[PDB]
Design brief:
part of a larger assembly; 4 chains; A: little secondary structure; 8% helix; elongated; B: 147 residues; mainly alpha; RNA-binding; DNA-directed RNA polymerase activity (chain C); transferase (chain C); DNA binding (chain C); ADP-ribosylation (chain C)
RNA sequence: AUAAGGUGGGGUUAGUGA
């Protein structure tokens, strides 16, 4: 399968989730530090498409 | 003794905990091909146990240290149960092998033996049954204290 | 021994002035010269700008339609903005200005407790017939040089550096006094340089207050 | 083989710190050693710091 | 601890006064 861009993630806290949009992208101008998450990218491992 | 819902809720937090600390394992194995061998197959057994964030796992680490610092045996079997994920009977075997003929005097008589593997089960079980009951109101306030 | 006293504060200009200390013994002109120079440059209470929230702006590295200047030049112009506050320890100021022309210091919504000192200090030029700026300028007390990174939340809140220092330039001069029938006595003359936010007698009195508190520490 | 690329521009402000190389126009190099407060500078009779 | 990582080419930095 493909890979996805949205703000859905497994198992991180709401701290990094505070600074994304509804699409999973940081707003313009949100000041960030090291180790913060810019774009939540996930892979569907185990997608079927059967 | 604690209740059923408490056993559930606390049990979920603890498996997230030992899952989290188990990720701080010293070293694994793997290779340099297997990842390439891995992304284009469906594995089957997803061994990826889910864990909490670092805030919760650190916090309840402070909790479990905060009560369980007094007994290192009970702490050790606690990490055996959630960290390694090993069963009660398995550490009944590990523990029973080296329980040490410490000359415990039974209701049978003066004896020089390990207490049995039939003994060592309820040995284990009364430990963590009390232990969760000890740590539960502390932790249940602890999420509320952050709250 | 004797003790010096204030004889004069020569208010030579609006910005700065010269005070006079007299009489003194040997070395104490140089002693309090280096001393009070070092204290007056050291630490006075300041009233700097703290942070500015200009309205339609996400962040400092962008522009605004209707002004010739960048945001960055604007808030660095605000870093030099001096002001006097009396009754508070922090305050929020507000400006609203439209129409073609320069943006002076006069366009803030003044209060009775806050007081700008230099009305002519420009900020920017509006170039559009119909555009405006509306920022809120947070201003608090303080002491010393505080960068923005060493501190400690909505994205419109920009930051500045803190330059809590009213003073600019200190010079002292010793010479002999003209005392009655006596030599070896000393007129101390001190030249300070102030933006305009601090009166001199208050300044040196605060300085010697600090210095007495520091000699307090063992005897 | 790629579906979408997301470019992010991050903006840094850098001031100065003891250990930076800064130099004139005569081969006179220099690593900046100590940021020393104002009161310890040399100063003329007029009072201006160097 | 999921940022990792071979091969070429180019550019730069630091290396005396007799």
């Amino acid at each position: 399968g493909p890979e996805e861009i949205t703000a859905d993630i497994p198992n991180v806290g709401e701290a990094a989730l505070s600074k994304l949009d509804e699409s999973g992208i940081v707003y313009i101008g949100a000041e960030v530090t090291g180790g913060d998450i810019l774009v939540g990218k996930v892979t569907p491992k185990g997608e079927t498409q059967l | 003794n604690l209740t059923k819902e408490q056993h559930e809720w606390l049990n979920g937090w603890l498996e997230l905990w030992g899952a989290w600390v188990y990720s701080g394992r010293l070293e694994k194995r793997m290779s340099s091909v297997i990842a390439k061998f891995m992304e284009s197959v469906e594995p089957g057994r997803v061994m990826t146990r889910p864990m909490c964030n670092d805030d919760d796992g650190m916090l309840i680490s402070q909790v479990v240290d905060s009560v369980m610092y007094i007994d290192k045996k009970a702490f050790g079997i606690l990490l055996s149960y959630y960290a390694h994920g090993s069963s009660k009977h398995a550490i009944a075997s590990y523990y029973h092998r080296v329980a040490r003929p410490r000359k415990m005097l039974c209701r049978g008589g003066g004896r020089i033996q390990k207490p049995s593997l039939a003994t060592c089960r309820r040995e284990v079980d009364e430990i963590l049954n009390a232990s969760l009951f000890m740590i539960y109101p502390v932790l249940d306030s602890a999420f509320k204290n952050r709250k | 021994f004797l003790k010096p006293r204030l004889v004069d504060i020569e208010q030579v200009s609006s910005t700065h002035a010269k005070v006079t200390l007299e009489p003194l013994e040997r070395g104490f002109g140089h002693t309090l010269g280096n001393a009070l120079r070092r204290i007056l440059l050291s630490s006075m209470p300041g009233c700097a700008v703290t942070e500015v929230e200009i309205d339609g702006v996400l962040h400092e590295y962008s522009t605004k339609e209707g002004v010739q200047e960048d945001i960055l030049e604007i808030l660095l112009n605000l870093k030099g903005l001096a002001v006097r506050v009396q009754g508070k320890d922090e305050v929020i100021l507000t400006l609203n200005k439209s129409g073609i022309g320069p943006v002076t210091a006069a366009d803030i919504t003044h209060d009775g407790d806050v007081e700008i000192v230099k009305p002519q200090h420009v900020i920017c030029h509006l170039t559009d017939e119909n555009a405006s700026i509306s920022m809120r300028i947070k201003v608090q007390r303080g002491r010393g040089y505080v960068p923005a990174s060493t501190r400690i939340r909505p994205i419109g809140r920009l930051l500045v550096d803190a330059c809590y220092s009213p003073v600019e330039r200190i010079a002292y001069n010793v010479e002999a006094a003209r005392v009655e029938q006596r030599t070896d006595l000393d007129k101390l003359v001190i030249e300070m340089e102030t933006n305009g936010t601090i009166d001199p007698e208050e300044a040196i009195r605060r300085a010697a207050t600090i210095l007495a508190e520091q000699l307090e520490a063992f005897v | 083989g790629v579906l979408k690329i997301v470019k992010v521009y991050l903006a840094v402000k850098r001031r100065i710190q003891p250990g930076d190389k800064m130099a004139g126009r005569h081969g006179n190099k220099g690593v900046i050693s100590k940021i020393n407060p104002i009161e310890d500078m040399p100063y003329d009779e007029n009072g201006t710091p160097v």
